[PDB]
Symmetry: C2
Subunit: 271 residues, 2 copies
């Protein structure tokens, strides 16, 4: 209730370490409605919001020259899973000499409070606020005319493939695809509209952007925030120009834009 943020509850910083802590019950919407293979698993897109708001607050009152946050070189390790007992997640920030901020998202195993498990790591950059780029909504939709499928068709396999998305994570409206890209109409589930205000990178919309692509998120090269993900009405997914099939891991680009095509959130070098 008195949380600083639904994903960043409490500031637990010491003289040695800048740190934020959150205790998650199974009931949070981004857990109860994000069940993979039967377990409540923290979604990859929640780590980004966790990281952003930690940086936003850990950096003090800021000048226009530092009043914007960008994330770089994100990594994903073991996921956070919730059972009958709550799970405490720690968000650690470490300032580097070049003015960038390294962040580690970790926890202390109930198996061993002296052992440690890292779930994600990355870097953040403070820059001047960025003017939003623009996308071509009319033509891009026109380049995605082959084998369109309903959200339900997207949704049916998702449930069948082992990903049981609850109502809070049913943000895709429809998929328009060509062999080169996928453009997804997006919507905010009505359940989470009451709390969409308290997110910049909203897990429902951000995950819907990731859902439109789909083995699992493994890394992200860069994340740019021009406006709230809530403003988004469309999202475009494309391969990064690496052209490597490899095994089951791929490098992809994902962008969010509003009704006019103005990009508000863009993700580069996904993996």
């Amino acid at each position: 209730p008195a949380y600083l943020h639904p994903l960043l509850h409490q500031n637990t910083s010491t003289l040695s370490e800048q740190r934020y802590s959150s205790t998650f019950t199974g009931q949070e919407f981004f857990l109860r409605d994000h069940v993979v293979n039967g377990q409540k698993v923290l979604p990859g897109v929640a780590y980004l919001e966790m990281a952003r708001v930690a940086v936003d607050m850990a950096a003090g009152v800021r000048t226009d020259n530092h009043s914007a946050i960008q994330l770089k070189n994100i990594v994903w390790a073991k996921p956070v899973i919730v059972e009958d007992a709550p799970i405490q997640v720690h968000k650690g920030l470490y300032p580097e000499e070049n003015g960038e901020i390294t962040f580690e998202i970790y926890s202390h195993p109930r198996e061993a409070e002296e052992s440690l498990v890292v779930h994600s790591q990355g870097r953040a950059v403070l820059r001047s606020a960025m003017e939003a780029p623009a996308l071509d909504l009319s033509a891009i939709q026109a380049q995605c005319t082959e084998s369109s499928y309903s959200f339900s068709q997207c949704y049916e396999t998702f449930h069948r493939i082992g990903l049981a998305y609850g109502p809070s994570h049913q943000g895709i409206e429809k998929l328009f695809v060509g062999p080169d890209q996928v453009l997804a109409k997006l919507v905010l589930p009505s359940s989470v509209t009451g709390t969409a205000e308290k997110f910049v990178l909203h897990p429902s919309v951000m995950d819907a952007a990731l859902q439109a692509s789909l083995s699992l998120p493994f890394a992200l090269e860069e994340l740019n925030i021009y406006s709230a993900s809530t403003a988004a009405a469309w999202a475009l997914v494309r391969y990064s120009d690496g052209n490597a099939t490899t095994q089951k891991v791929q490098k992809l680009d994902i962008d969010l834009c509003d009704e006019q095509g103005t990009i508000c959130v863009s993700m580069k070098g996904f993996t």
Copy 2:
């Protein structure tokens, strides 16, 4: 409701600054019952607990060689006053290269949030727990037979000079005075017993120990209140709640004036075992 401590509610630390924040409404017992010249004033001794608990928390889990806190060279500047508008008070901690921790207690006036008021600053030292010294209460009593003052005498006199202590700050039971010292019988007011557990340096007990210096000033014409101005050293051997007595004597500086007095103050339980010691405590007339 979710305070870390009644005097240190929230950790608001940034990368640049280790910081804790508290918002006081004035309904807190240590404000509602601590009225100076008609205004609710945070008691000077409350800053001491503020610093201690901030340091204790800002210092991590700690080895025993560092599992004890001492405060040094405390100064008091403008008071914290609450009159209908809540005040947000910040505890800033800076680690010094010598391993000491500097603390600043400050706030930003609501009327111009870009301005700054520093209320108190000092230094904290992390060191090994000290075996608690002891007082000989029998011997001390034998030297405080010159005059004596009752509970009502003290708090009626306090009200007359401008210090309207409510029940939470009525910890003096009786004052025994001899030449150059005062022995004060103390008790934790019944009003605050429910939350005495969450204080090491309890404002009620600590303020009562400083109140005991009234013993030196009874009989002073148009006596004016003297408030905390500086403290050279504070030693914490155990919680003040255990305290049953307080000894007040002048520090061996021989610099006593109506404007300012410097005192040595010890608090001990019924056996004479000291729990808190304050050396070089200077108080100054209010004006």
